[PDB]
Symmetry: D2
Subunit: 248 residues, 4 copies
């Protein structure tokens, strides 16, 4: 029987490359999405064309609310409904936008802390309660201690995510569930960003003056789920080309 | 005129010691409280006995909800309305209890993440919007070696580190410094003495917990003129506890 | 055709396991040793039987002295002599013993700082001067929670972190990646008490080597300045 | 009696501000120096005219060698000879210069950069503890230790080791009541020979005020860690850099 994996925010960009490589490695995949229905269904088709009955989609909004836990429970239940098991959780979905200290503020809190941290915690709980090489990989941020100006809520959410990574590694280790992270520095840059600003960020990177490809982020995820990382838990692998080492 | 400070969860234990020492240094104080009205008021009366009209109380729940922004805005506003200014914010209030991965879960989230992180964020934003100005957040020296089954608490304290760092950077252009004090084991909970002694015995420096006053002293330093170039720093005050391997 | 790797302290335990796995991935290897000549040779023999002229040995003391730079330069030179190239440097050799604050002390400095930090710096220098290129330093997952009375060893592994980060920055323009692997308790009733603290299964060399193999691979081409803990969660356990 | 402190590299700049501030708080001080004999004596003179028999000087080269342990033992012994006690050690002396990976011999660069920044602190810590109240040790660390300057690998290594020593010695000396902490500047007094334009490049990076720390600001954090207001603090490193370490590339 092939193992199965949930990848959140898997319709595009890094989550898609993660889903692809997991599927190329032998996994069946739940492709979670919020608004990108076309791209999600289109990816599941591409994957099912390669091996039938190996990909489903699952829509959920990952904003914090009093029904977020039932949404998270549903994401994990969909893996067990499609495949009869759930071996890997990848917490990849993320909101990312400025929240200057000087959308209502309670929506910003619900989006940036819900998606980046609370949803991973609830997915983790549902993943653990429903339970072999079981593991969780959280998508962290290499720059979490050198934050972007005016991104306090985002940064808080990614700090919380490190805390979860550690806390869940400790508490879940006696059930055989490993919990780790992968921390991009700059990888695929925002759709909305202009070409001058992208090159400003690209020239800061010591290793090659370029962003990480999505595939490079995925390769680290593939490592942490593999049999070659079976003692690794509570570790966060930076994949940023040295960017976090560069002083102001 | 005397400067003014808000201290959250100031009725008892560490927040009380903080409020007292700020008052001793010449601060006027807003004593924020949630359920401990009697202790908050008894503190404000003692402080006002030392110096008239120097202490007020402000009740608010710091649990995350759609009224939290208005509550935090009101706490800052109460310092301005009482004293004409707000020089210092101490984010001390904290919920602390286990949340095993294996009250509803969304209440746990609102309490643990609200008090420890979202309320500090909202307070920080209101403090800055309304302007030796500084903020001090009460962090946790053990944030990278967390207690088993305290995932939400740990996430809240991690978020608080992120706030400390993010606000320090963003508020440095306004002359507002943002720092933290990270206790290890300080005043312990009704916890049996035999259980207290198991924690005390792990502390290299003296085999004892920090007093509240010892934590307050680091807060006093960070708000002082002796720390005018210090921002984005977190001072551990654990007796070496975080250095001790399993 | 085939890439080549230098592994220090490669005769036994973790370094052997690293050398074996690199060789199994298609590397030619320099097996460095200090006192374990028989074990280095026996390893080289097992590897060369698998594929002829793919494994050589190099003796060198990695204690800091006036001669250490020459020794380090020759380790790298042996890789170039045997194989025509040097793609990977694994700094694995390490001295480990207590040095209470309360052998002369300067000999302790020379071994614990020399082997753990200065020889890695000289090796890294020689390696870069001679040029998928990468260096992997064997770090410590417990560097922040150090063993009681191990101050010099602890200084040496801290220094190795600083080297990892500094060399990642400075060599990145040359396409040389620099990373680390930090084991927890991979041992030299005391043994069983350490085993018992580990979250993940209360318990190999190969597990360390697996992480090294990842960091040298084409799957880590954007990773530099990263230290991968391989500790079963031990570094997360409070006192 | 008044307490006594040793401050290494105390003739000028931050070490001088630290000795001065400790002297202003009531300490008697050992002013260690290497080459700056004139500045050392001139400082001890001013302190002694403020209060007689309260400042001495002590010459030592802190480069690693087979005599370094004896030089470190002698520094500590100077304080006990002059003042009958030694309450505080401040490890402030530091060599600082590039050692590119791709003149001095390499073994001399190792001996100076690792010796002054890490080995001499370890040996001084050992002598301080063996020769033994609010006893403490403060190490001058570097706030930028994880975002290092390009081509400064041996300096960076030395400062990482010093973080290790701060932690290990805090752990091991706690049972004896000796606290060990650090203070970590970002950009404080710029190098004498750095030109103004270059200095201003560094200043402009600092979020809090776009200026370097004064030597006195660094010294304030030292004074705090040695005071009775830091009695439960050991193994902590306080950054004094105006936010510099938080600023991304
Ligand atoms: N790209 C980088 O440079 C970089 C740097 C550091 C860290 N990271 C982290 O690495 C991971 C992947 O990066 P990325 O650029 O691929 O992320 P991304 O494109 O910004 O977002 C990933 C997905 O998250 C989903 N999402 C956003 N808000 C959501 C909500 N309320 N509910 C559910 N899903 C929501 C979106 O799905 P739909 O499109 O279906 O709505 C989105 O496609 C993220 O966690 C990110 O923070 C990325
Ligand atoms: N004691 C320790 O060993 C230790 C260790 C690490 C970190 N810390 C941190 O140091 C700080 C002070 O510690 P402590 O032990 O003195 O704290 P505490 O006694 O646990 O709590 C401080 C105060 O927080 C307030 N609080 C709790 N939930 C609240 C809510 N929903 N809304 C508003 N206020 C709420 C309470 O106010 P009322 O009583 O008025 O309801 C309480 O008196 C905290 O941030 C704590 O996390 C302490
Ligand atoms: N085992 C663990 O649990 C653990 C934990 C933390 C970190 N690590 C690190 O992981 C790496 C490998 O660990 P390990 O237990 O396999 O190491 P180990 O067996 O203690 O030592 C590794 C090698 O270092 C060499 N060595 C020692 N002193 C030397 C000197 N003065 N000159 C030259 N070589 C010298 C030895 O060579 P000869 O036998 O040829 O003389 C030996 O083969 C080390 O860097 C270690 O510090 C290991
Ligand atoms: N300045 C900054 O921006 C900054 C930034 C980060 C960290 N720090 C740290 O803060 C501390 C003070 O900085 P600073 O700028 O005041 O230091 P500094 O002036 O560069 O050096 C301080 C003293 O160290 C002594 N020294 C150098 N090599 C020596 C040797 N081989 N033996 C004995 N002593 C030696 C010198 O004494 P003589 O003059 O008597 O020869 C020198 O006066 C240092 O540890 C430094 O690394 C400073
Ligand atoms: C200096 O710190 C940072 C730099 C760039 C980023 C990138 C920048 C970025 O491209 C990005 C994105 O497209 C999506 C996302 O969810 C998060 C992203 O973060 C994050 C940082 O914390
Ligand atoms: C993982 O190590 C830890 C040990 C003790 C504690 C103490 C234990 C403690 O007494 C305590 C408290 O009473 C209130 C509070 O808000 C936080 C508290 O934390 C926290 C840790 O994170
Ligand atoms: C509490 O911190 C630690 C505990 C054990 C270790 C292990 C203990 C260990 O088994 C070991 C070894 O066999 C060889 C070596 O070079 C280093 C070793 O370190 C390291 C620590 O930093
Ligand atoms: C990016 O990192 C750094 C930037 C500036 C510095 C300063 C720059 C500096 O002025 C300086 C000095 O004058 C003496 C000394 O011993 C160390 C010094 O370091 C250090 C860093 O590690």
């Amino acid at each position: 029987e092939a193992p199965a994996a949930v990848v959140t925010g898997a319709a595009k960009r890094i989550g898609r490359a993660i889903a692809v490589k997991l599927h190329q490695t032998g996994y069946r995949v739940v492709i979670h999405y919020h608004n990108s229905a076309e791209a999600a269904v289109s990816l599941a088709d591409e994957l099912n064309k390669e091996r039938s009955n190996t990909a489903v989609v699952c829509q959920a909004d990952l904003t914090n609310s009093n029904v977020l836990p039932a949404s998270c429970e549903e994401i994990i239940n969909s893996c067990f409904r499609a495949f009869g098991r759930c071996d890997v959780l990848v917490n990849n979905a993320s909101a990312f936008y400025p929240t200057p200290l000087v959308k209502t503020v309670e929506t910003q809190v619900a989006e940036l802390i819900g998606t980046n941290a609370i949803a991973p915690f609830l997915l983790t709980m549902s993943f653990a309660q429903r339970q072999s090489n079981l593991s969780i990989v959280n998508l962290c941020d290499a720059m979490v201690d050198q934050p972007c100006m005016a991104f306090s809520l985002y940064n808080m959410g990614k700090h919380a995510l490190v805390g979860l990574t550690q806390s869940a590694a400790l508490e879940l280790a006696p059930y055989g569930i490993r919990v780790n992270g992968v921390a991009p520095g700059v990888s695929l840059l925002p759709v909305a960003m202009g070409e001058e600003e992208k090159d400003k960020w690209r020239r800061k990177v010591p290793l090659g003056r370029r962003e990480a490809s999505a595939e490079q982020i995925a390769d680290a995820v593939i490592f942490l789920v593999s049999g070659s990382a079976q003692y690794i838990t509570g570790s966060i692998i930076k994949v940023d080309g040295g960017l976090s080492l560069v002083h102001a």
